[PDB]
Paper text:
The sulfonamides (sulfas) are the oldest class of antibacterial drugs and inhibit the bacterial dihydropteroate synthase (DHPS, encoded by folP), through chemical mimicry of its co-substrate p-aminobenzoic acid (pABA). Resistance to sulfa drugs is mediated either by mutations in folP or acquisition of sul genes, which code for sulfa-insensitive, divergent DHPS enzymes. DHPS catalyzes the condensation of para-aminobenzoic acid (pABA) and 6-hydroxymethyl-7,8-dihydropterin pyrophosphate (DHPP), producing 7,8-dihydropteroic acid (7,8-DHP); this compound is further transformed, ultimately leading to tetrahydrofolate, an essential precursor for DNA and RNA synthesis. All three Sul enzymes adopted the (ɑ/β)8 TIM barrel fold also shared by DHPS.
The Sul2·7,8-DHP·Mg2+·PPi complex structure provided essential insights into the molecular architecture of the Sul enzyme’s fully ligand-occupied active state, containing both products of the enzymatic reaction and with loops 1, 2 and 3 engaged in ligand interactions. In comparison to the Sul1 structure, the pABA molecule formed fewer interactions with the Sul2 enzyme and occupied the more solvent-exposed positively charged region of the active site pocket. In this conformation, the pABA carboxylate forms interactions with Ser214, the p-amino group with Ser52, and with aliphatic region of Lys213 and the sidechain of Phe179. All the protein-ligand interactions observed in the Sul2·7,8-DHP·Mg2+·PPi complex were consistent with those observed in the Sul3·DHP+·pABA·Mg2+·PPi complex, including the hydrophobic interaction between pABA and Phe177. The pterin group and the pABA group of the ligands bound to Sul2/Sul3 or DHPS occupied the same spatial locations in all analyzed structures. Leveraging our structure of the Sul2·7,8-DHP·Mg2+·PPi complex, we modeled 12 clinically relevant sulfonamides in the Sul2 active site through superposition with the pABA region of 7,8-DHP. This analysis showed that all 12 compounds would pose a steric clash with the Phe residue of ɑ6 helix, including the most primitive sulfa sulfanilamide, whose structure is the closest mimic to pABA. The modeling suggested that the sulfonamide nitrogen would be positioned 2.1 Å distance from the Phe residue, resulting in an unfavorable clash. The modeling further suggested that the N-acyl substituents off the sulfonamide nitrogen that define the different compounds would exacerbate the clash with F179, at least using their energy-minimized conformations in our models.
Numbering used by the authors:
A (entry chain A): 4 to 271
B (entry chain B): 1 to 14, 24 to 270
The structure:
């Protein structure tokens, strides 16, 4: 099927909604709203990773997420922790989160023993930065080759340390995580099924509100809802297993139309 | 045909004063419409009927302005007196939810250059909540167009003036599945008649059955259905909101470009 991650940024400067859900009550309120609007999982991010973002200590990330995890765990709301800091990831594992979402793709082998002892699923993201986004360009050649080579090595490293293959979800990266050229993001949005087929693992895409959509439409920062929906539905039609989005309700409505079209056309 | 997607922007007088109807028309063109579909009345399931005189009075000053602006106009009316008035003002299209069933009007249609949006409905008129006939809805639509294209071209209306609209929503009956079949299968009409197809899904009630939000905003479901229709080959889309559609089409065009270019 398709699992929707609803983005809740507990940050002062996330690129499209910084500050909004900084207070734990604001983040909790948004998380519950997003679940009612169609999210299946709340992707909780205590620090921005956009190009102009500023990092914070793991102590601060934990202080930002701790009351929110308390509430969502009591609420029975599944949580993915969007953090690249191993100390924050370790805290989340001790609270029993459903997923870890690492924009660095779990590159720290010293943390692998702790990853292996947990049941949490792991969203392993590829980036050309191997970290916080920036505006460099992607390597020359076929971007899908570069992404597959990354996942080949990182999956072998993770599974070699006792993280079971079926815990893994693959995110090829999107937007500035793929470099400054919108063509690179469009290639990955068009061709991520090559990753699903090669690795026989689910794929997660996060196109929501990313800058390459503004470049295609000629539009300003708060004007990218329609382009986002079109890109998300194209990802769904391409077979995406997870979509991480700021606005699950338009996505849910669009998926309802596409699913009903599919069922209606079936000859069985 | 090769022509790229043409968007009809909906301006329904029902209340728009003419200055407001003119303003919304210009707005829709700025947002991505190619043609303004101007409707003086309402053909919802529940909207009251006005006289042909009232329809003409409502559109006359709006046509004045849109004509002066060089804005192509499709007149959405099923009343032949209103259609005759619009033809005499040289509109680009007539859009008839009855599909031009009145053969007494065919000589006047034959003498105009205007293109004709010929819509199918299970009512043969204003939308209601009856359900569809037994059998494949696509067969009933094809049979309707077989007969009506033959009738229109038989009266001297040249075939290439015709745009086919299979109907949508309550024009197809109360079941959402009937609209979904048509939205999924309308290309069958394109290839059977070698004529372009127009679809109008915008804000129709079957999309509400899928949002679960009843009377609430249905722009997202509308966009999804419109993009599916564009991807499925629709030649025209009639919509309330061209701008999100143009944005979505820009994403698909940029994606398409990667598949080959
Ligand atoms: N799994 C996963 N997690 C994320 C992602 C993402 O793409 N996938 N993006 C995030 C947002 N950071 C940005 C990066 C690039 C851009 C941009 O290109 O506009 C915006 C935001 C953060 N967390
Ligand atoms: N060519 C063309 N013209 C129209 C159409 C339409 O579907 N095609 N729909 C119209 C609106 N009438 C409605 C019918 C049904 C529904 C509904 O199902 O909700 C809503 C509105 C009027 N004008
Ligand atoms: N509720 C609706 C009212 C009008 C129309 C339309 O003119 O297409 C569609 C839906
Ligand atoms: Cl099938
Ligand atoms: Mg974030």
């Amino acid at each position: 099927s398709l699992i929707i991650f609803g983005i809740v940024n507990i940050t002062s400067d996330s690129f499209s909604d910084g500050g909004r859900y900084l207070a734990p009550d604001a983040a909790i309120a948004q998380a519950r709203k997003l679940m009612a609007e169609g999210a299946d999982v709340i992707d909780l991010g205590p620090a921005s990773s956009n190009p102009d973002a500023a990092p914070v200590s793991s102590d601060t990330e934990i202080a930002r997420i701790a009351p929110v995890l308390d509430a969502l765990k009591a609420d029975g709301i599944p949580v993915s922790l969007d953090s690249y800091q191993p100390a924050t990831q370790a805290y989340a594992l001790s609270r029993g989160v459903a997923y870890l979402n690492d924009i660095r793709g779990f590159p720290d082998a010293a943390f692998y023993p702790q990853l292996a002892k947990s049941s949490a699923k792991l969203v392993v993201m590829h980036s050309v930065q191997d970290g916080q986004a920036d505006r460099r360009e992607a390597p020359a050649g076929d971007i899908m080759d570069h992404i597959a080579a990354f996942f080949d090595a990182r999956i072998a490293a993770l599974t070699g340390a006792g993280i079971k293959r079926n815990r893994l979800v693959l995110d090829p990266g999107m937007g500035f995580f793929l470099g400054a050229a919108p063509e690179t993001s469009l290639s990955v949005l068009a061709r991520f099924d090559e990753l699903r087929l090669r690795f026989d693992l689910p794929v997660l895409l996060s196109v929501s509100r990313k800058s390459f959509l503004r470049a295609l439409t000629g539009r300003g920062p708060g004007d990218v809802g329609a382009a986002t929906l079109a890109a998300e539905l194209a990802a769904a039609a391409g077979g995406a297993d997870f979509i991480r989005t700021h606005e699950p309700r338009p996505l849910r409505d669009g998926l309802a139309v596409l699913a009903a079209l599919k069922e209606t056309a079936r000859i069985r």
